[PDB]
Structure 1
């Protein structure tokens, strides 16, 4: 025999086992315990056995039985049997051939556990900032204590000490307690916590009595797993959930946005390509938000499983792991708030706010793994310029020596001992990188900022590489690695990414300072703008030990966030504009930069999973989220996928293209120019440009939303039920979302699709591209060819934009981040609305703008704050008869050219039905009033048409044209029209031409019929308006025009307008 091996926990992997583990790893009462053992080489006459004690008494040896052979190894199973709660088992596994040299593993000890639950509350002590509930247990000898405290008046914290020896934390004092024999009720202005005493059972209500959530009906819901003496290994609680309850968040999830029915693992993992199918993630957070208006956060870095009505149809549960330490309390929060987004804000109060990034982070990021030399960077920049792609971010991955990851590829130098840091001048730059500082300067010259790829591991591939070997020696001599549990440095398991590499212990501040010192010259001298901090899902092994005294079970989920945060803070300390770009983390990840959705293939299925990842991350407080648009690997995307992806990406928090392959031919860049080359579809370029230019037009809105995340916890991109939690149609939507406060975005994420269903919540929505009006409260069908993205603005929206003199979306304003071209506010008037604009160009002043819509009196008023810039309003309305600024008349400009020349003025855009109003910069509020205005027209051409078509061959129409002829039976034009100012009689203006003869049409108003007379117009180039009395109810009204048997003559039908 050459050896024997058994190790009960293997690498402690959640998903797999090594072939030499104990099963179960942590045996409970009544579970059969199997030991898997290996010997080598394969030989006759081998004996494998187990020497062991039960509660200190030597047992008869167990003989292991042959199981299987693989390679030059035999695998064996030894059966120890079942045990009782409290049993302490110690064993050693042994092997030898024909009574020769004996090889052994162990000794190993396990303590056999079972569940104990809270039984009754026996007394309650109110300490003014905390409440102690003294408890009995269902089994065992503990005297548990549950501590209640308020993180705020709407955020409840539970801390359980099974032994009673630990004490909970103080919280707010603003509560009262009604403590009776049978029940204790804890009340704040926001919450009513009702706790039955016998059996103990908690219900969490809002202050008005509405139930948020509650412990399971049968009580004994809250428990711990113990041997009663040495260990507590798990905690659980169990809660009642009705059949319609939806559960969102849990970090970044690829499979679904609503986790009901699933067991969700809070476990970071590097899963390539098939995250959705395996239900794995790089970014796992033990926090969810329910559409029943609460969130739950289990405050622990240990692995937890959330069982979301996956076992019992009306029960959800959490099972939280522990390392055995009996002094670690269970700590969790039930989180209420003013609305769903406020629940997320309260969660970020606990775990950390998003840090506002510089505005350059919100432009296009360009990346490709194949970029590996200065000529590649030069050509990326010149390709972007030649194709009018004004990006702001630039990533280099294949930049380094591929050994130290802090030295440029091909650089030569005198190696340094003892981990001493390099300066720029220590290097002779050669080959692929002759002048890194110059290269960076060229990136900056293009208006871009650059980040460099990093990992948290010291690579050790077993080869000789002087500087890396020097650094490894130094790192070990200082104790800068984690420890494997035996005194040796922890290494990533050999089969994994960077296997054999030594992790830097990011819990050790000295270690971090050393590691970052080696990169300092990249920031201070080369002038980089941050790091793409990749990896981090690299902590395996229960005995792996960190400088904070924590071990592998506790640190696996936390490690990536320690790593990412260390680098983010370090880069920012030198370069205040630095940005991190990362994939892995847990609670608190949001403090430290951008998160991208990792490694996915270029398919529509992947696109679907990416969108779910962003929407779940958003609920989990990770707002600055990116994805590799159209996928970074697999076969090159189709033109269709590339175009659909581009549109979504332009309307996502962070826009970035990227590609996996390191030296491919042809190129694998997901750049728009390479996509044209690879697909042969030249129309990719103008479509990409449209969406990129539109994003840059919206940058003032986007960046205000980024600040709103940082300040108020409102994520930039949100699943519909975050804004509409009571809306039954919004619960499961995963192919549309809100972007900022105002825009409903509905990407096409299905191959071959052109009829996109869009669910519109109650209220009026307006198509931002063309002014099409859509009353809410139904699913509409929107025709979207491959170049088209349905996007709608909600009623009352005030949307800041940076426009060219053309004043249309999708016109290139460039990538200047320090000035505006034409600062513009797009307004959809509806009652009184207000918006706080983040004017970052002018010192970050908040500009409070308000609009008062009064269409009943044919007026819209805008209260413009003091501004540093000329401003243009674009107000969705009919053409005013006059406009005043501070009471002073402003003249109508007849053309766009005249408007651009004017200092102040107004202009009416007939295509978009937008009134442009130009106001000078002034260090004082300005009152703008639009007079004689009504709600914008309902264009006939945007109506539901039956057997009738559109044209535009006679000038003077509004919108894009008119409905032509409309002069046979079974032809109809249907409008969905909102009552502008509630249920009332109104006048419907019908604008038409009838160049040959008097016409009539029939109209139905919510089923009520009348015939209208449309007198002849002089010719087909003359429009007239007839006023029709109608009666409209609140909200959406069905207005149907048709041509019936008693109607006559052709018309061209331009629009209708509703006015008082």
Structure 2
């Protein structure tokens, strides 16, 4: 705000005057004045004498004036510049300019309080002078007059017909012009005439100026305007035809053009030009469509013919241009325009891709409220129905939002629109085909016409405001769902993965994490669907292997629950109650259910709480009254509490799901689709409670309205835990539909009986479930599963009479392993016809067969196996190799490649062997896949009989980051070489702790090993607290000043059978200040965990990119880095990571070299190591692309990367380390447009 200081120097020189101004410092301010004409002054104020910044493009770069011969009198105060037309006075103390006409009439002046300064100019003038310039008005603005006497509007180009600029002038005889890129002119009626640079304007600012460069004009308005044009430039003469009339038109072809010129010329109405809109050019098409004549509209524009013919009729042609390019063709491929622009840097800075339209259509809303309107609507839909549209996705039945069109549909429009399709489809098919619709509103009554509700155009983000504030995200959806159920519309779904993003359709897809969690969530909601924006893809395989496998996995649960679910579809036809409900339905009196939405009920007998948090390590799950059993991990929890529930943030395999005491859950084999085959055995899992609970099994055609007139099947199933027995009542069949179910296999959990009766006959016992299923006629067996003791009972379904079943006695199985027959598991491959198969054509197999056809690349079988805690499980694979030699197969667990198995010849195809492999399993569901990974060097070509999975691990593990943290303890990725997704720090204040829930099979002494880091330089202490008992001291030495170093602290602890608590806490005598990573637990001596073989830091690149890692990078001097890490979800279609969420990439649009490197000291010198990695490369074949192993004491080893567009595995075996170190790396030399993806890099000790 301060003004100039005293003048200390005045150097005249021709028409120029340079004034030095005191600012108190050794670098004086400079003010140069230049008389450009008798009526035009240039002023340049340069703070501290600094060199002036370049003038903006306002200024004509070639401007030129004759010598003026001004008169500069520096001999007094004021200093005085004179011409015949003006008189410029500068008072010496402080420096202040006054501008006058040559007759001494004062025009404007810098007030005492301040003139020119660092950020502008400030004048004062006659208060009644009229001011013009600054601005005009656009086609969306209140349009004022000419006068600018009270103006604060910015100076800008603007939009939609606006104009403006740093130019303020008056009819009183002066003008002011400032060279600026935007800015804030200011006038008021006290007589101020100011201009300020200010802060960055709405339009951006790309020309900054450290100096202030202005011009003062003197004269009548013509002279002012002519002076304005000497400075900014005169206008070149346009063609003379430009003074003619021009007809502009959008929607026009050559024929209509020629008819229009005829019409003008026939009538002697003069005209010189037609301007053509989009019609003229191939806008939308590849190869510079937006610059090329559309010869469909204008055939003779193939040559100069059109031009020359229009010339001869006296017409010139004008074409519309937009300053942008099409970056996608119709087929969503990148255009040549895009590649040329992206590669040379031609896009406007800060403007990303966005979605436009350009072919409008004219529409009008139909009225569904009229019966005759409905009949018409239906009649015209019949042909589309006969030809395949059997469900009606009734969009936009609510509100129009199109420019000026802002029309609401009424409250019954969704009901009535549904009525049209319902009444019509029913009458047309004689009640033969059921109606499915969906809409995006609901109002009472709409449900009578068979419609679902979906939650509209929601956002691709975790929550409202994560990426943008204008739509909700995933976390809000449960609330929308349950709100709908509270309104009587529980047939609800959402766009899983989200619809909208920033940029519209060209905006990003979900992260793999978001995609995965959303699928697990949506699998436990009623209408389960993905839906992206235009040209987007929502197929799970596109988001990397975790997303595929986890989605597949949860999908298998859903489809196995088909008969559970379908009973609730029937319930909705009796009472309106559906597949989901909020907890307050079951718990009207419980305050903690009153507003509860992070969990809900799926049918009557399952409570679900999906992991919806980004990078979530644990959940706080409220369980209302009763006794709940973890569906996936086996443990019981008592009701009426908020539990701490650990989740594995690395696998994304967990879907917290709890079984309600009394549960009765019919389930079936997994089908690819609902009527793929007939199901003759239905399983019923039964979790008995002390009070009778029931579930009515239901079947019908799944297709027609026959159910309405009795054509359905139902059978009441009921159970109760009695003093010393379980009772299960299978009621008699009811209704005329002949069901497909022939037998139920009851799986009664919590008791392994010594006898099972039915009508006062003891049933025949069999040695196991397998033999029971082979037997025709009733039977029982017993066993063990994840939940504990279980009794199996197989009966006929659909008897004409009730059957009571009573399980008494207790004779627990000694079984040490679950058995999974792989022929019952999931079979896949590269195509529908190249999947793994079932066969019974060689002898010696267990169960009903074995799995064959693992002899075409990518064939595989996948087993879902429940483990009670994370840890090491030796899993036994029963196979047959009658080939002549050792075959290979990959074993993937939870989408990570655990090992290449070498499976020996077993003599013949009917001779079987066993290979047992130590697998890193996580608590709850695991995904174990045996696959012919041709791209990883496997051979395939064996047959698989089954696997066996110990009920108990050899050793257990517990992630610290998933433990219950308190007192300041937190999670972190800001140090290196932690395990899993993170570690625990901030064990700093007294009270700070982490508390593990550790399961033991039997009371005893158990070994612990606690992985920790202590970078303080000295020994530090925590306390251990086992089952809230007495504190024992935990003394933790420091290997030195390095927090990227991790030791084991080993100790013992006395535990009880079941859940134990073991806390590591800073009690007041302890020092704290350590980091915890993982607690290992065993009855034996604890060794290296299968989950922790990897010696690399951040080898999967999953660490949040804010935090660095042991990776370094190199590129040739002065070249931009070609290296980044992200998910590949901005791309369309997505180019996901090999596992989890992120992968490194190398890319540049131009020629480039790049490398990344990591050096690790190995634990054991003079020994053999192994580098494994996933790699995917695409587009331009590089000169060089390899993994690199070196520094190990031998010479560099390499493995080249092949340009395939697919995930391959790259293995460098037999790294003989004698140096103490390994350097692993990846290197690319490309001529440009080579895109390399690197992921899941492991350096391991090689057997």
**Structure having greater relative contact order (Cα 8 Å, sep ≥ 6):** 1
Scaled by the length of structure 1, the TM-score of the pair is: 0.40
Structure whose CA Rg is larger? 2
